[PDB]
Design a protein around this motif. Sequence first.
Motif, PDB file in Angstrom:
ATOM      1  N   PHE A   5       1.045  -1.102   0.001  1.00  0.00           N
ATOM      2  CA  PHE A   5      -0.151  -0.086  -0.240  1.00  0.00           C
ATOM      3  C   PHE A   5       0.598   1.311  -0.203  1.00  0.00           C
ATOM      4  O   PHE A   5       2.187   1.178   0.735  1.00  0.00           O
ATOM      5  N   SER A   6       0.534   2.774  -1.411  1.00  0.00           N
ATOM      6  CA  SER A   6       1.559   3.189  -0.580  1.00  0.00           C
ATOM      7  C   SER A   6       0.557   4.697  -0.082  1.00  0.00           C
ATOM      8  O   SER A   6      -0.656   4.893   0.353  1.00  0.00           O
ATOM      9  N   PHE A   7       1.735   4.649   1.205  1.00  0.00           N
ATOM     10  CA  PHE A   7       1.295   6.264   1.787  1.00  0.00           C
ATOM     11  C   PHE A   7       2.431   6.603   1.769  1.00  0.00           C
ATOM     12  O   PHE A   7       3.261   6.967   1.808  1.00  0.00           O
ATOM     13  N   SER A   8       1.610   7.826   2.079  1.00  0.00           N
ATOM     14  CA  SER A   8       2.478   9.209   1.518  1.00  0.00           C
ATOM     15  C   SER A   8       3.090   9.638   2.952  1.00  0.00           C
ATOM     16  O   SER A   8       3.351   8.742   4.292  1.00  0.00           O
ATOM     17  N   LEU A   9       3.776  11.112   3.415  1.00  0.00           N
ATOM     18  CA  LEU A   9       4.495  11.634   4.779  1.00  0.00           C
ATOM     19  C   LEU A   9       3.596  12.487   5.618  1.00  0.00           C
ATOM     20  O   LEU A   9       4.192  12.748   6.636  1.00  0.00           O
ATOM     21  N   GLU A  10       2.830  13.079   4.338  1.00  0.00           N
ATOM     22  CA  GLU A  10       2.139  14.327   4.893  1.00  0.00           C
ATOM     23  C   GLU A  10       1.606  14.012   6.686  1.00  0.00           C
ATOM     24  O   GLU A  10       1.602  14.451   7.350  1.00  0.00           O
ATOM     25  N   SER A  11      -0.010  13.250   5.724  1.00  0.00           N
ATOM     26  CA  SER A  11      -0.730  13.086   7.573  1.00  0.00           C
ATOM     27  C   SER A  11       0.618  12.007   8.611  1.00  0.00           C
ATOM     28  O   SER A  11       0.659  12.413   9.687  1.00  0.00           O
ATOM     29  N   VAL A  12       0.936  10.929   8.276  1.00  0.00           N
ATOM     30  CA  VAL A  12       1.449  10.115   8.657  1.00  0.00           C
ATOM     31  C   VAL A  12       2.713  11.563   9.898  1.00  0.00           C
ATOM     32  O   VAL A  12       2.739  12.136  10.877  1.00  0.00           O
ATOM     33  N   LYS A  13       3.669  12.697   8.909  1.00  0.00           N
ATOM     34  CA  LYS A  13       4.351  13.594   9.734  1.00  0.00           C
ATOM     35  C   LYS A  13       3.327  14.199  10.708  1.00  0.00           C
ATOM     36  O   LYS A  13       3.731  14.425  11.710  1.00  0.00           O
ATOM     37  N   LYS A  14       2.138  15.382  10.575  1.00  0.00           N
ATOM     38  CA  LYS A  14       1.459  15.764  11.604  1.00  0.00           C
ATOM     39  C   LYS A  14       0.610  14.645  11.547  1.00  0.00           C
ATOM     40  O   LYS A  14      -0.479  15.303  12.154  1.00  0.00           O
ATOM     41  N   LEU A  15       0.746  13.892  11.764  1.00  0.00           N
ATOM     42  CA  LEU A  15       0.046  12.685  12.379  1.00  0.00           C
ATOM     43  C   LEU A  15       0.343  12.482  14.236  1.00  0.00           C
ATOM     44  O   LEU A  15      -0.712  12.525  14.243  1.00  0.00           O
ATOM     45  N   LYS A  16       1.305  13.340  14.724  1.00  0.00           N
ATOM     46  CA  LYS A  16       1.139  13.981  15.997  1.00  0.00           C
ATOM     47  C   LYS A  16       0.781  15.090  16.541  1.00  0.00           C
ATOM     48  O   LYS A  16      -0.035  15.304  17.392  1.00  0.00           O
ATOM     49  N   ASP A  17       0.637  15.695  15.740  1.00  0.00           N
ATOM     50  CA  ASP A  17      -0.235  17.045  15.817  1.00  0.00           C
ATOM     51  C   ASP A  17      -1.212  17.710  14.331  1.00  0.00           C
ATOM     52  O   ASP A  17      -0.443  18.053  13.951  1.00  0.00           O
ATOM     53  N   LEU A  18      -2.025  16.693  14.310  1.00  0.00           N
ATOM     54  CA  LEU A  18      -3.457  17.462  13.203  1.00  0.00           C
ATOM     55  C   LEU A  18      -4.251  18.211  14.012  1.00  0.00           C
ATOM     56  O   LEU A  18      -4.952  17.381  14.837  1.00  0.00           O
TER      57      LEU A  18
END
Length: 94
Positions: free
Chosen positions: A8-21
């Motif tokens: 599965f292809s996962f972007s790094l945006e949501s993950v990066k801002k995952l801790k602070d979204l």
Amino acid sequence: VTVQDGNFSFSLESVKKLKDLQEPQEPRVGKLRNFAPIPGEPVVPILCSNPNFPEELKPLCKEPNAQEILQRLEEIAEDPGTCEICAYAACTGC
């Protein structure tokens, strides 16, 4: 070009801002995804801690390895590595 931890292809945006979204989905940002904090917050409630996290990673949150994957994603989110240079299978679409 996104970070893929499996089929599965996962972007790094949501993950990066995952801790602070705290906002609706955010498309590409002029800023570089390299200001993410440090990985080390394994959290996975019924589905996912962030009510608006990288939903594309839903399966990761429903998997026992999510604890180890979440952290990893956070690290790559704060740094491209070989993924950005397609130096390995870490990034797909190259």
